Amino acid sequence: FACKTANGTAIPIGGGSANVYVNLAPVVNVGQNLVVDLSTQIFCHNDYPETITDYVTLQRGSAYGGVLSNFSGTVKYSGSSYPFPTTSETPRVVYNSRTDKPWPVALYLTPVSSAGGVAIKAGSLIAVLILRQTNNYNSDDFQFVWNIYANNDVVVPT
Amino acid sequence: FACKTANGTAIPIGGGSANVYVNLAPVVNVGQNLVVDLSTQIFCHNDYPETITDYVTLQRGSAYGGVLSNFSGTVKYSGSSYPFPTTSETPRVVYNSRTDKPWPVALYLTPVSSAGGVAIKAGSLIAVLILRQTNNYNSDDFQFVWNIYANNDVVVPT
Numbered sequence: 203f204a205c206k207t208a209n210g211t212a213i214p215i216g217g218g219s220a221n222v223y224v225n226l227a228p229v230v231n232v233g234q235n236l237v238v239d240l241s242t243q244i245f246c247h248n249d250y251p252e253t254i255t256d257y258v259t260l261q262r263g264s265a266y267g268g269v270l271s272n273f274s275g276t277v278k279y280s281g282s283s284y285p286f287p288t289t290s291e292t293p294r295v296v297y298n299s300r301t302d303k304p305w306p307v308a309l310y311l312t313p314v315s316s317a318g319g320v321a322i323k324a325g326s327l328i329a330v331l332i333l334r335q336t337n338n339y340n341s342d343d344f345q346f347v348w349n350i351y352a353n354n355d356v357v358v359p360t
Numbered sequence: 361f362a363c364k365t366a367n368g369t370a371i372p373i374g375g376g377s378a379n380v381y382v383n384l385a386p387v388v389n390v391g392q393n394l395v396v397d398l399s400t401q402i403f404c405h406n407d408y409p410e411t412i413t414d415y416v417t418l419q420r421g422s423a424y425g426g427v428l429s430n431f432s433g434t435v436k437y438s439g440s441s442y443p444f445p446t447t448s449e450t451p452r453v454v455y456n457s458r459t460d461k462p463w464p465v466a467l468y469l470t471p472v473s474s475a476g477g478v479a480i481k482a483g484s485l486i487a488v489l490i491l492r493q494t495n496n497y498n499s500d501d502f503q504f505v506w507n508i509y510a511n512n513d514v515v516v517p518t
């Protein structure tokens with residue numbers, strides 16, 4: 203089991219850490235949502251699916267920088283929604299193919315009501331998402347840690 | 361099969377990730393190349409050359425930060441040249457000795473016409489190069505992920 207990012211990098215068997223740079227809507231008004239869809243960015247696969255089932259959770263999601271201070275939101279993982287920053291590990295999603303498949307994580311973020319002007323700075327860390335991978339085969343229990351960065355400023359107009 | 365960097369770190373049998381810092385020409389004009397030769401830094405060896413042949417490709421090369429935004433380039437891998445960021449996995453290089461041999465990868469980067477001022481920041485991630493290793497012996501298929509960082513600022517004069 204290993205993962206890769208779009209036009210990007212890989213975190214190999216055994217886990218590790220990587221940076222993911224995402225383009226964000228440049229303007230988001232109070233009452234609109236900023237959507238950070240990692241399912242187009244992070245892809246994973248099972249290396250021996252004919253005998254091994256891989257189990258993958260979002261063990262934890264935390265907010266940083268402008269997202270931490272100026273937005274509130276939720277995280278959607280494989281079709282269910284949870285608080286973000288997270289309060290517990292999600293249910294497992296099964297990976298059972300050698301073909302790269304999306305990690306089905308998306309953040310749905312909305313400006314706090316007093317936010318105005320530059321709410322997220324270009325180049326800044328906005329989130330850390332920990333993918334936890336286990337299996338039905340051995341004692342493997344690995345973390346794949348994704349540091350998520352904004353490529354551009356996001357402005358909340360006034 | 362494992363790899364190390366000169367005065368540096370190691371990625372052991374089975375693959376993994378490591379960080380590599382490179383010195384860059386401090387001033388580079390439109391129409392000139394920054395040459396980043398990793399073959400003097402990254403070295404690999406075969407752990408059982410008497411019965412095993414190791415096959416090593418450049419699986420993917422990706423650009424980040426100032427290189428992604430301010431440069432275009434190519435990669436030379438074992439005597440052939442390709443676009444960088446890459447568009448496919450290269451042909452293989454054979455490793456058949458216990459003696460350290462260079463991984464023969466070099467990047468040639470040239471500023472785009474909008475580059476001006478500090479086009480690459482000191483300390484910043486500039487590229488990821490993924491070495492994929494297999495053999496003629498078993499099912500081993502491992503990735504060695506090299507994160508390339510700039511040691512110094514590179515300026516594009518205006």
Ligand SMILES: OCC#Cc1ccc(O[C@H]2O[C@H](CO)[C@@H](O)[C@H](O)[C@@H]2O)cc1
Pocket residue numbers: 203204215216247248249250251254255256336337339342499
């Ligand atoms: O002889 C035939 C074979 C084989 C094979 C054995 C283990 C293995 O582990 C990785 O791939 C597994 C499956 O994706 C993971 O569950 C492990 O955590 C680990 O990443 C992958 C392939």
Ligand SMILES: OCC#Cc1ccc(O[C@H]2O[C@H](CO)[C@@H](O)[C@H](O)[C@@H]2O)cc1
Pocket residue numbers: 361362373374405406407408409412413414494495497500
């Ligand atoms: O009885 C003596 C023996 C033996 C032996 C079997 C496998 C092996 O794998 C490593 O070294 C091999 C050769 O470098 C690699 O192809 C593998 O992927 C792995 O890194 C090394 C030695």
Ligand code: NI
Pocket residue numbers: 203204247248249
């Ligand atoms: Ni694989």
Ligand code: NI
Pocket residue numbers: 362405406407
């Ligand atoms: Ni060795």
